[PDB]
Amino acid sequence: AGAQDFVPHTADLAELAAAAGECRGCGLYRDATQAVFGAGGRSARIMMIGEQPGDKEDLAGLPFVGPAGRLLDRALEAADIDRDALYVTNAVKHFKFTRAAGGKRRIAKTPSRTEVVACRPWLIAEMTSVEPDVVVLLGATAAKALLGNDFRVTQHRGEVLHVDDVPGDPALVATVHPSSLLRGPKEERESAFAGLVDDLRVAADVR
Ligand code: SF4
């Protein structure tokens, strides 16, 4: 099933990342430039999971390098969370996209639940390798990957969650994806930014 046979029997993140470059667990490896594995080290206490690598990530080979990554950096700084404590990754590891004539970027397309479930073996390997105390789920795709396809991020803000089939029973905090805070009226963006900082502080205060 899915990516499972492509995942080697190791918790070494460099070896896992190299193996993900050879993954054919769903169709997304075909058009993407490369797999984008998570970044950070196994001592990280906080793991953060987004949806997928975007246009800039697909070419950088690293998660959270675009405008949404810069906004997340601003929120992490505001939450007094250092990168040293972080392992950051995405629910799926290959960019799914299309282009529009006149566009200034490749347009991210939503991974199907089928793709998320196919790629989940990599997320499980990362979680087994890092043993985080807390997992921050950025957006619906990531939150549903671990909490269920019916899960609604909008209904559980600020809440520390724990589910049974997650490796190591870490705390889980589901929040908005930073990409959503880039647009909208100023007062709504400012209120949303504050709520993202609040959710990051909840996660950082676990244990
Ligand atoms: S998105 Fe995940 S399962 Fe699909 S080919 Fe890429 S690494 Fe494999």
CB proximity list for 115: less than 8 A, separation 6 or greater = 26, 27, 28, 92, 96
Beta strands 46-50 and 134-138 are parallel
- Return the residue whose CA atom lies nearest to atom 7 of ligand 1: 93
Per the CB < 8 A criterion, the answer to whether 8 and 19 are in contact is: yes
Nominal resolution (angstroms): 1.6
Distance 61 CA to ligand 1 centre (A): 14
> Experimental method for this entry?
X-ray
> Is 9 assigned to a binding site?
no
Distance 24 CA to ligand 1 centre (A): 6
Strands (E) across the chain are located at 46-50, 86-90, 97-98, 107-108, 134-138, 171-175
Token digits of residue 34: 């490369």
DSSP class of residue 110 equals: P
> For ligand 1, is residue 47 a contact (CB within 6 Å)?
no
CB proximity list for 198: less than 8 A, separation 6 or greater = 158
Which residue range forms the structural domain that includes residue 55? 1-207
Please, what's the largest Cα pairwise distance for the chain?
A: 50
> For ligand 1, is residue 26 a contact (CB within 6 Å)?
yes
- Into how many domains does the chain fold? 1
Ligand 1 pocket test, candidate residues 7, 16, 24, 28, most atoms within 8 A of CB: 28
By the 10 Å C-beta count (0-12 exposed, 13-18 middle, 19+ buried), 162 is classed as exposed
